[PDB]
């Protein structure tokens, strides 16, 4: 049955007591009462089938979340769709109900040094598990960090994730959407090198800076304006850092730039723990090759109160895409989706 203002939710009879929460990109988001687990849950109504790009993101998220198990990563409790592929044009993903997200909270609260500390630890702990699976989130930002308490953070939205391929660099600038602009590492914008774990560390860096001041550290209007913001704080890059600029066209808008001095961090963030600011510096390195890696970040003195390699799981097996799906007809992907969501349909054998 089921309804809720406007668009009606083909959930139930399991899920009831609906109550609109918010909006997704191409789907709605309510909270329901799960009458099996006897708790309130969140249900994402997803209809992506019209543009093939939406079916990529939806399929990637399901395949990845369905194989990940980690306490700082959202899971999929239930997927429910129509019986017939032909009859399927919505898909409902059931996930644990979370109270808010780091974006919503940064709109209403400055965070103590302490809370920031264990928020960052939980981010990197989940990131450690993602990277050990040979996976890149690629869209880490505050609104993709769901929060229940200061001790319950879960990374969500794996719509842009990729298996890591330092070699799969394609140099297609407009060929891919990689990171929301404010959290996009420089090598993405300079080389189109969006297949290395370095890009996620940059994003986390940006999140750390945003926690320290409640405002995003590099808020560019467009990709070139994003670079001016980066250089305005980091400063004009070195010769060596202009050597990993493969886009031979890219070295120019740089070279035709007025040298900018490096803004000392304690000047940007004078109330922040000097240890926070040291880690920030390792994470916001212009050159991907010199940027700190996730396990090194966890080991940083700033997180020494929580670091515990024995209580930080890694993936049992590197992840693998059974067939790459960049250029697949959008009805093939809807096929592949109907397939992957078969787990949660009656009679599913094997
Ligand atoms: N599990 C959840 N619990 C609570 N809210 C959720 C979710 C999920 I998945 C999504 N949302 C809503 O989408 C925003 C993050 O993109 C969130 O801020 C929210 O508007
Ligand atoms: Na999401």
């Amino acid at each position: 049955p089921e309804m809720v203002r406007g668009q009606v939710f083909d959930v139930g009879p399991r899920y009831t007591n609906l109550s609109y929460i918010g909006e997704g990109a191409y789907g709605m988001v309510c909270s329901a009462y799960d009458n099996v687990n006897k708790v309130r849950v969140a249900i994402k109504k997803i209809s992506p089938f019209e543009h093939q790009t939406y079916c990529q993101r939806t399929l990637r998220e399901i395949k990845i979340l369905l194989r990940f198990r980690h306490e700082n990563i959202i899971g999929i409790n239930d997927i429910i769709r129509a019986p017939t592929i032909e009859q399927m044009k919505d898909v409902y993903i059931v996930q644990d109900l979370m109270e808010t997200d780091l974006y919503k909270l940064l709109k209403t609260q400055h965070l103590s040094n302490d809370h920031i500390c264990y928020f960052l630890y939980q981010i990197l702990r989940g990131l450690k598990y993602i990277h050990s699976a040979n996976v890149l989130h690629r869209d880490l930002k505050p609104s993709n960090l769901l929060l229940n308490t200061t001790c319950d953070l879960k990374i969500c939205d794996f719509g842009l994730a990729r298996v890591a391929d330092p070699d799969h660099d394609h140099t297609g600038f407009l060929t891919e959407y990689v990171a929301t602009r404010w959290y996009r590492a420089p090598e993405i914008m300079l080389n189109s090198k969006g297949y290395t774990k370095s890009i996620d560390i940059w994003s986390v860096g940006c999140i750390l800076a945003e926690m320290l001041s409640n405002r995003p550290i590099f808020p560019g209007k467009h990709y070139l304006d994003q670079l001016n913001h980066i250089l305005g704080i980091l400063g004009s890059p070195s010769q060596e850092d202009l050597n990993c600029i493969i886009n031979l066209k890219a070295r120019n808008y740089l070279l035709s730039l007025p040298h900018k001095n490096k803004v000392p961090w304690n000047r940007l963030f004078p109330n922040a723990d000097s240890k926070a600011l040291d880690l920030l510096d390792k994470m916001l390195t212009f050159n991907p090759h010199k940027r700190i890696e996730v396990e090194q970040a966890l080991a940083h003195p700033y997180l020494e109160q929580y670091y515990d390699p024995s209580d930080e799981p890694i993936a049992e097996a590197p992840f693998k895409f059974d067939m790459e799906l960049d250029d697949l007809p959008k009805e093939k992907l809807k096929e592949l989706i109907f397939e992957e969501t078969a787990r949660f349909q009656p009679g599913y054998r094997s």
Side-chain angles (χ1 to χ4, degrees):
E2 297 298 357
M3 47 240 309
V4 92
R5 56 205 68 163
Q7 261 274 349
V8 301
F9 255 67
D10 188 272
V11 310
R14 177 161 176 191
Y15 311 104
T16 88
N17 287 32
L18 281 73
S19 168
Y20 172 98
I21 276 188
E23 275 292 347
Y26 29 102
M28 199 166 156
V29 167
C30 285
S31 77
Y33 185 88
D34 185 328
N35 286 115
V36 180
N37 300 326
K38 314 276 186 177
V39 292
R40 296 202 65 91
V41 294
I43 295 141
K44 192 145 80 175
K45 200 255 204 60
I46 292 189
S47 15
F49 298 115
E50 255 55 52
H51 198 287
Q52 181 263 10
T53 255
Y54 294 165
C55 301
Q56 287 207 22
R57 289 153 181 204
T58 289
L59 172 67
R60 301 192 120 100
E61 182 155 60
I62 300 170
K63 293 183 82 289
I64 290 163
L65 294 191
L66 247 39
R67 190 188 288 172
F68 281 6
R69 210 247 50 117
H70 192 287
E71 65 177 29
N72 302 118
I73 304 173
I74 204 53
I76 288 167
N77 305 347
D78 196 7
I79 296 183
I80 43 195
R81 70 182 156 57
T84 122
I85 178 142
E86 325 169 55
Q87 197 162 0
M88 187 196 58
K89 181 141 287 183
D90 303 331
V91 178
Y92 299 81
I93 316 306
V94 187
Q95 294 175 294
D96 295 333
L97 177 63
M98 306 286 297
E99 186 173 309
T100 189
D101 56 68
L102 183 62
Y103 173 87
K104 269 141 67 190
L105 179 73
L106 291 169
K107 293 318 203 44
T108 88
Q109 209 102 234
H110 283 256
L111 296 181
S112 72
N113 177 43
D114 279 322
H115 290 176
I116 291 171
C117 187
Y118 190 65
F119 274 151
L120 180 63
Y121 174 79
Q122 298 186 84
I123 293 173
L124 300 179
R125 179 180 187 265
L127 193 53
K128 173 183 166 157
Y129 179 90
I130 307 136
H131 284 187
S132 74
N134 201 36
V135 176
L136 311 200
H137 190 275
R138 303 209 315 172
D139 191 41
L140 289 174
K141 62 191 168 146
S143 65
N144 286 340
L145 299 177
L146 302 173
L147 309 178
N148 265 335
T149 74
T150 55
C151 292
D152 190 9
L153 184 154
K154 286 168 188 307
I155 309 170
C156 78
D157 187 38
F158 286 72
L160 304 184
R162 295 285 193 287
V163 182
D165 207 347
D167 329 10
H168 184 359
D169 260 75
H170 62 307
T171 318
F173 274 91
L174 283 42
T175 66
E176 256 180 11
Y177 186 75
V178 190
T180 305
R181 183 198 318 114
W182 293 346
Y183 311 91
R184 178 178 302 153
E187 64 281 19
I188 298 172
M189 295 179 290
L190 299 178
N191 308 342
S192 210
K193 191 224 300 291
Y195 281 88
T196 47
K197 292 167 179 171
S198 54
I199 76 157
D200 284 348
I201 298 296
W202 182 271
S203 289
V204 173
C206 296
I207 288 163
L208 174 45
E210 202 161 331
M211 282 189 303
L212 295 166
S213 69
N214 285 66
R215 78 246 174 192
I217 186 189
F218 305 120
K221 308 175 171 168
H222 53 51
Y223 109 71
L224 294 169
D225 183 38
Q226 196 60 42
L227 296 165
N228 309 17
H229 272 81
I230 291 169
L231 296 206
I233 297 200
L234 266 50
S236 297
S238 64
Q239 300 298 315
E240 173 166 11
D241 300 335
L242 291 132
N243 276 341
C244 69
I245 293 180
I246 274 50
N247 178 276
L248 315 157
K249 188 279 162 182
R251 321 146 143 177
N252 64 353
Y253 187 63
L254 284 177
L255 298 70
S256 51
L257 99 315
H259 187 264
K260 255 271 185 293
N261 283 345
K262 169 175 198 47
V263 164
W265 287 118
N266 48 341
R267 232 93 74 88
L268 216 320
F269 305 111
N271 298 304
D273 185 323
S274 76
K275 291 185 179 297
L277 288 186
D278 182 65
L279 182 48
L280 185 55
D281 194 85
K282 315 293 217 309
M283 308 193 303
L284 294 182
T285 75
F286 180 86
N287 178 339
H289 309 295
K290 58 186 214 294
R291 192 175 306 142
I292 197 168
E293 296 139 337
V294 63
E295 185 83 28
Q296 310 177 295
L298 280 179
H300 188 276
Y302 180 58
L303 285 33
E304 62 202 352
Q305 294 167 339
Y306 308 104
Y307 187 40
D308 185 358
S310 90
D311 189 28
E312 295 165 6
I314 64 174
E316 306 205 12
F319 192 95
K320 286 283 75 247
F321 53 94
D322 32 313
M323 328 263 191
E324 244 308 51
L325 345 72
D326 302 288
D327 60 305
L328 261 73
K330 78 172 196 169
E331 309 85 23
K332 174 59 167 186
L333 299 179
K334 164 167 186 166
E335 217 184 77
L336 302 166
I337 287 176
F338 183 81
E339 153 181 320
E340 193 82 13
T341 49
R343 299 203 23 182
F344 304 84
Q345 303 303 285
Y348 171 80
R349 213 51 242 191
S350 282

Short mmCIF file of all heavy atoms in Angstrom, two decimals, residues 102-140:
data_model
loop_
_atom_site.label_atom_id
_atom_site.label_comp_id
_atom_site.label_asym_id
_atom_site.label_seq_id
_atom_site.Cartn_x
_atom_site.Cartn_y
_atom_site.Cartn_z
N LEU A 102 27.24 14.94 8.77
CA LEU A 102 28.20 15.96 9.16
C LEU A 102 27.89 17.31 8.52
O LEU A 102 28.23 18.35 9.07
CB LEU A 102 29.62 15.54 8.79
CG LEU A 102 30.66 16.56 9.25
CD1 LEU A 102 30.62 16.68 10.78
CD2 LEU A 102 32.05 16.16 8.74
N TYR A 103 27.27 17.31 7.34
CA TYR A 103 26.92 18.59 6.73
C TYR A 103 25.84 19.29 7.53
O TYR A 103 25.99 20.47 7.89
CB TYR A 103 26.45 18.38 5.30
CG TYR A 103 25.92 19.64 4.67
CD1 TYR A 103 26.78 20.53 4.03
CD2 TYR A 103 24.57 19.94 4.72
CE1 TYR A 103 26.30 21.70 3.45
CE2 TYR A 103 24.08 21.10 4.14
CZ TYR A 103 24.94 21.98 3.51
OH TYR A 103 24.44 23.13 2.94
N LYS A 104 24.73 18.60 7.79
CA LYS A 104 23.64 19.18 8.56
C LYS A 104 24.12 19.67 9.93
O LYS A 104 23.70 20.73 10.40
CB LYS A 104 22.50 18.17 8.70
CG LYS A 104 21.43 18.26 7.57
CD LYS A 104 20.91 16.91 7.08
CE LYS A 104 20.10 16.14 8.11
NZ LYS A 104 19.81 14.73 7.67
N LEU A 105 25.05 18.94 10.56
CA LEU A 105 25.50 19.30 11.91
C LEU A 105 26.43 20.51 11.88
O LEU A 105 26.40 21.34 12.79
CB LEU A 105 26.19 18.10 12.58
CG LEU A 105 26.74 18.29 14.01
CD1 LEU A 105 25.64 18.34 15.06
CD2 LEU A 105 27.77 17.21 14.39
N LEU A 106 27.28 20.60 10.86
CA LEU A 106 28.18 21.75 10.77
C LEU A 106 27.41 23.03 10.49
O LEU A 106 27.95 24.11 10.70
CB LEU A 106 29.24 21.51 9.69
CG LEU A 106 30.30 20.44 10.01
CD1 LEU A 106 31.14 20.09 8.78
CD2 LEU A 106 31.20 20.81 11.19
N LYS A 107 26.17 22.93 10.03
CA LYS A 107 25.31 24.10 9.92
C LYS A 107 24.81 24.60 11.28
O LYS A 107 24.33 25.73 11.37
CB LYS A 107 24.12 23.80 9.03
CG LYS A 107 24.47 23.56 7.60
CD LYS A 107 25.52 24.56 7.15
CE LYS A 107 25.47 24.72 5.65
NZ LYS A 107 24.04 24.82 5.23
N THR A 108 24.90 23.78 12.34
CA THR A 108 24.34 24.20 13.62
C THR A 108 25.29 24.08 14.80
O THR A 108 24.85 24.29 15.93
CB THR A 108 23.09 23.39 13.97
OG1 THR A 108 23.51 22.21 14.67
CG2 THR A 108 22.34 22.99 12.74
N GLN A 109 26.56 23.74 14.60
CA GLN A 109 27.40 23.51 15.77
C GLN A 109 28.87 23.60 15.40
O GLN A 109 29.30 22.97 14.43
CB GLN A 109 27.09 22.13 16.37
CG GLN A 109 27.32 22.03 17.84
CD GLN A 109 26.02 22.10 18.60
OE1 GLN A 109 25.86 22.91 19.50
NE2 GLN A 109 25.07 21.26 18.24
N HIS A 110 29.63 24.36 16.17
CA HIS A 110 31.08 24.23 16.12
C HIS A 110 31.46 23.01 16.94
O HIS A 110 30.82 22.70 17.94
CB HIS A 110 31.76 25.49 16.66
CG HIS A 110 31.75 26.62 15.68
ND1 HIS A 110 32.87 26.98 14.95
CD2 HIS A 110 30.75 27.43 15.26
CE1 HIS A 110 32.56 27.98 14.15
NE2 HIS A 110 31.28 28.28 14.32
N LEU A 111 32.47 22.29 16.49
CA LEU A 111 32.85 21.03 17.11
C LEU A 111 34.08 21.22 17.98
O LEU A 111 35.07 21.82 17.55
CB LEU A 111 33.12 19.95 16.06
CG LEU A 111 31.98 19.49 15.15
CD1 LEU A 111 32.46 18.39 14.18
CD2 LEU A 111 30.80 19.00 15.98
N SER A 112 34.02 20.70 19.20
CA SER A 112 35.19 20.73 20.05
C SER A 112 36.33 19.99 19.38
O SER A 112 36.12 19.08 18.57
CB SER A 112 34.91 20.06 21.39
OG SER A 112 34.82 18.66 21.20
N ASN A 113 37.55 20.35 19.76
CA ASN A 113 38.68 19.59 19.26
C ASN A 113 38.45 18.10 19.43
O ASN A 113 38.78 17.30 18.54
CB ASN A 113 39.96 19.98 19.96
CG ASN A 113 41.10 19.15 19.49
OD1 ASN A 113 41.23 18.93 18.29
ND2 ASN A 113 41.89 18.61 20.40
N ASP A 114 37.92 17.69 20.57
CA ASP A 114 37.83 16.27 20.85
C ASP A 114 36.90 15.55 19.87
O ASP A 114 37.22 14.48 19.36
CB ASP A 114 37.36 16.04 22.29
CG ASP A 114 38.50 16.17 23.31
OD1 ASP A 114 39.62 15.73 23.00
OD2 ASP A 114 38.28 16.70 24.40
N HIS A 115 35.73 16.12 19.66
CA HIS A 115 34.72 15.48 18.86
C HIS A 115 35.19 15.37 17.41
O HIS A 115 34.98 14.39 16.70
CB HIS A 115 33.39 16.22 18.86
CG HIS A 115 32.69 16.14 20.15
ND1 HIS A 115 31.49 16.81 20.40
CD2 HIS A 115 33.05 15.40 21.29
CE1 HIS A 115 31.12 16.49 21.64
NE2 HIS A 115 32.03 15.62 22.24
N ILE A 116 35.86 16.42 16.96
CA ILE A 116 36.50 16.42 15.66
C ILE A 116 37.48 15.24 15.55
O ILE A 116 37.53 14.54 14.51
CB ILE A 116 37.22 17.75 15.41
CG1 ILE A 116 36.22 18.89 15.23
CG2 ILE A 116 38.15 17.64 14.23
CD1 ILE A 116 36.88 20.25 15.20
N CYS A 117 38.25 15.05 16.63
CA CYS A 117 39.30 14.04 16.65
C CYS A 117 38.72 12.66 16.39
O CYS A 117 39.18 11.94 15.50
CB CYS A 117 40.04 14.06 18.00
SG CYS A 117 41.49 12.99 18.11
N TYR A 118 37.69 12.29 17.14
CA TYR A 118 37.14 10.96 16.99
C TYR A 118 36.20 10.85 15.79
O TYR A 118 35.97 9.75 15.29
CB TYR A 118 36.44 10.53 18.29
CG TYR A 118 36.05 9.07 18.31
CD1 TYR A 118 37.03 8.08 18.29
CD2 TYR A 118 34.71 8.69 18.31
CE1 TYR A 118 36.68 6.75 18.29
CE2 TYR A 118 34.34 7.35 18.30
CZ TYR A 118 35.34 6.39 18.29
OH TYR A 118 35.00 5.06 18.29
N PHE A 119 35.67 11.98 15.30
CA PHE A 119 35.02 11.96 13.99
C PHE A 119 36.02 11.64 12.87
O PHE A 119 35.79 10.76 12.04
CB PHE A 119 34.34 13.31 13.73
CG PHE A 119 32.95 13.40 14.29
CD1 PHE A 119 32.42 14.62 14.68
CD2 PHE A 119 32.17 12.26 14.44
CE1 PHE A 119 31.14 14.70 15.21
CE2 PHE A 119 30.89 12.34 14.96
CZ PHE A 119 30.37 13.55 15.35
N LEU A 120 37.15 12.34 12.85
CA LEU A 120 38.18 12.03 11.87
C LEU A 120 38.67 10.59 11.99
O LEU A 120 38.90 9.92 10.98
CB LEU A 120 39.35 13.01 12.04
CG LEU A 120 40.51 12.82 11.07
CD1 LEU A 120 40.00 13.07 9.64
CD2 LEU A 120 41.64 13.73 11.40
N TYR A 121 38.89 10.11 13.23
CA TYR A 121 39.32 8.72 13.39
C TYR A 121 38.33 7.75 12.76
O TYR A 121 38.73 6.75 12.16
CB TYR A 121 39.49 8.36 14.87
CG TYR A 121 39.81 6.90 15.06
CD1 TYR A 121 41.08 6.41 14.85
CD2 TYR A 121 38.82 6.01 15.41
CE1 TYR A 121 41.37 5.07 15.00
CE2 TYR A 121 39.09 4.67 15.57
CZ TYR A 121 40.37 4.19 15.37
OH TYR A 121 40.61 2.84 15.52
N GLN A 122 37.04 8.01 12.95
CA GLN A 122 36.07 7.10 12.39
C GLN A 122 36.02 7.20 10.88
O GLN A 122 35.77 6.19 10.22
CB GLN A 122 34.70 7.39 12.98
CG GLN A 122 34.60 7.18 14.50
CD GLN A 122 33.16 7.35 14.94
OE1 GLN A 122 32.37 6.41 14.87
NE2 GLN A 122 32.80 8.56 15.33
N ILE A 123 36.27 8.39 10.33
CA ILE A 123 36.33 8.52 8.89
C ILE A 123 37.46 7.67 8.34
O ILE A 123 37.25 6.83 7.45
CB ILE A 123 36.49 10.00 8.49
CG1 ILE A 123 35.23 10.77 8.85
CG2 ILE A 123 36.71 10.10 6.98
CD1 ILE A 123 35.37 12.23 8.66
N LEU A 124 38.66 7.83 8.90
CA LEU A 124 39.84 7.13 8.41
C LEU A 124 39.77 5.64 8.67
O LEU A 124 40.35 4.85 7.92
CB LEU A 124 41.10 7.71 9.05
CG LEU A 124 41.31 9.18 8.77
CD1 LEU A 124 42.57 9.70 9.45
CD2 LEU A 124 41.39 9.39 7.28
N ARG A 125 39.11 5.24 9.75
CA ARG A 125 38.98 3.82 10.03
C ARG A 125 38.14 3.15 8.95
O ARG A 125 38.53 2.12 8.38
CB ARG A 125 38.39 3.62 11.42
CG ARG A 125 38.16 2.19 11.86
CD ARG A 125 37.55 2.15 13.31
NE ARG A 125 37.47 0.80 13.87
CZ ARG A 125 36.40 0.02 13.81
NH1 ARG A 125 35.28 0.42 13.23
NH2 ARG A 125 36.44 -1.20 14.34
N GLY A 126 36.98 3.74 8.64
CA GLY A 126 36.22 3.28 7.48
C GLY A 126 36.99 3.41 6.17
O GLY A 126 36.91 2.53 5.30
N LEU A 127 37.71 4.51 5.99
CA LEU A 127 38.50 4.64 4.78
C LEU A 127 39.54 3.53 4.69
O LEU A 127 39.80 3.00 3.61
CB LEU A 127 39.17 6.02 4.70
CG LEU A 127 39.74 6.30 3.30
CD1 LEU A 127 38.69 6.11 2.17
CD2 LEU A 127 40.30 7.68 3.20
N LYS A 128 40.13 3.15 5.83
CA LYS A 128 41.11 2.08 5.81
C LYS A 128 40.52 0.81 5.24
O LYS A 128 41.15 0.12 4.43
CB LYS A 128 41.66 1.84 7.22
CG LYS A 128 42.58 0.64 7.34
CD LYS A 128 43.01 0.46 8.80
CE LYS A 128 43.63 -0.92 9.06
NZ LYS A 128 44.50 -0.89 10.27
N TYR A 129 39.28 0.50 5.60
CA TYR A 129 38.62 -0.68 5.08
C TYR A 129 38.32 -0.55 3.59
O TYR A 129 38.42 -1.52 2.84
CB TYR A 129 37.34 -0.91 5.86
CG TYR A 129 36.53 -2.11 5.43
CD1 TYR A 129 36.75 -3.35 5.99
CD2 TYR A 129 35.51 -1.99 4.49
CE1 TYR A 129 35.99 -4.44 5.62
CE2 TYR A 129 34.76 -3.07 4.12
CZ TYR A 129 35.01 -4.30 4.68
OH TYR A 129 34.28 -5.41 4.34
N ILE A 130 37.93 0.64 3.14
CA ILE A 130 37.61 0.82 1.72
C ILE A 130 38.86 0.61 0.89
O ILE A 130 38.88 -0.20 -0.05
CB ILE A 130 36.99 2.20 1.47
CG1 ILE A 130 35.78 2.43 2.39
CG2 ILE A 130 36.58 2.33 0.00
CD1 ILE A 130 35.76 3.83 3.01
N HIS A 131 39.94 1.29 1.25
CA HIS A 131 41.18 1.18 0.49
C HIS A 131 41.74 -0.24 0.49
O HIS A 131 42.26 -0.72 -0.54
CB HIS A 131 42.18 2.19 1.03
CG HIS A 131 41.89 3.59 0.59
ND1 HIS A 131 42.74 4.65 0.83
CD2 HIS A 131 40.83 4.09 -0.09
CE1 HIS A 131 42.22 5.75 0.30
NE2 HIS A 131 41.06 5.44 -0.25
N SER A 132 41.60 -0.97 1.61
CA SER A 132 42.12 -2.34 1.66
C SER A 132 41.36 -3.27 0.73
O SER A 132 41.88 -4.32 0.35
CB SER A 132 42.05 -2.89 3.08
OG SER A 132 40.71 -3.20 3.40
N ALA A 133 40.13 -2.93 0.40
CA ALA A 133 39.37 -3.61 -0.63
C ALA A 133 39.78 -3.17 -2.05
O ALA A 133 39.13 -3.58 -3.02
CB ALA A 133 37.88 -3.34 -0.40
N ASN A 134 40.84 -2.37 -2.20
CA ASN A 134 41.25 -1.82 -3.50
C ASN A 134 40.13 -0.96 -4.09
O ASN A 134 39.87 -1.01 -5.29
CB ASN A 134 41.65 -2.94 -4.48
CG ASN A 134 42.55 -2.45 -5.64
OD1 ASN A 134 43.40 -1.57 -5.49
ND2 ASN A 134 42.37 -3.07 -6.80
N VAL A 135 39.47 -0.17 -3.24
CA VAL A 135 38.34 0.64 -3.67
C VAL A 135 38.57 2.10 -3.30
O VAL A 135 39.22 2.41 -2.30
CB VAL A 135 37.01 0.15 -3.07
CG1 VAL A 135 35.87 1.09 -3.45
CG2 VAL A 135 36.72 -1.25 -3.56
N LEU A 136 38.02 2.99 -4.14
CA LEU A 136 38.08 4.43 -3.99
C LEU A 136 36.65 4.94 -3.83
O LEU A 136 35.82 4.71 -4.72
CB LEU A 136 38.71 5.11 -5.22
CG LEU A 136 40.01 4.68 -5.86
CD1 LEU A 136 40.53 5.85 -6.69
CD2 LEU A 136 41.00 4.29 -4.81
N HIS A 137 36.38 5.67 -2.74
CA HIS A 137 35.06 6.27 -2.60
C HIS A 137 34.81 7.29 -3.70
O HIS A 137 33.85 7.20 -4.47
CB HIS A 137 34.87 6.90 -1.21
CG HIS A 137 33.46 7.31 -0.92
ND1 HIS A 137 32.93 8.52 -1.31
CD2 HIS A 137 32.45 6.65 -0.30
CE1 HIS A 137 31.67 8.60 -0.93
NE2 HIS A 137 31.35 7.48 -0.31
N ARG A 138 35.68 8.30 -3.78
CA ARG A 138 35.71 9.33 -4.81
C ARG A 138 34.72 10.47 -4.56
O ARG A 138 34.74 11.45 -5.31
CB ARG A 138 35.47 8.78 -6.23
CG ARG A 138 36.46 7.71 -6.66
CD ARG A 138 36.68 7.69 -8.17
NE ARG A 138 35.45 7.78 -8.95
CZ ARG A 138 35.43 7.93 -10.27
NH1 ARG A 138 36.55 8.05 -10.96
NH2 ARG A 138 34.25 7.96 -10.90
N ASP A 139 33.84 10.40 -3.56
CA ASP A 139 32.89 11.50 -3.33
C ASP A 139 32.73 11.73 -1.82
O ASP A 139 31.62 11.91 -1.30
CB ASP A 139 31.57 11.22 -4.05
CG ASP A 139 30.63 12.43 -4.07
OD1 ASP A 139 31.09 13.58 -4.28
OD2 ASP A 139 29.40 12.22 -3.92
N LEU A 140 33.85 11.73 -1.11
CA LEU A 140 33.82 11.98 0.32
C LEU A 140 33.56 13.45 0.59
O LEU A 140 34.28 14.32 0.10
CB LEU A 140 35.12 11.54 0.98
CG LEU A 140 35.36 10.03 1.08
CD1 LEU A 140 36.72 9.76 1.61
CD2 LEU A 140 34.31 9.28 1.89
#
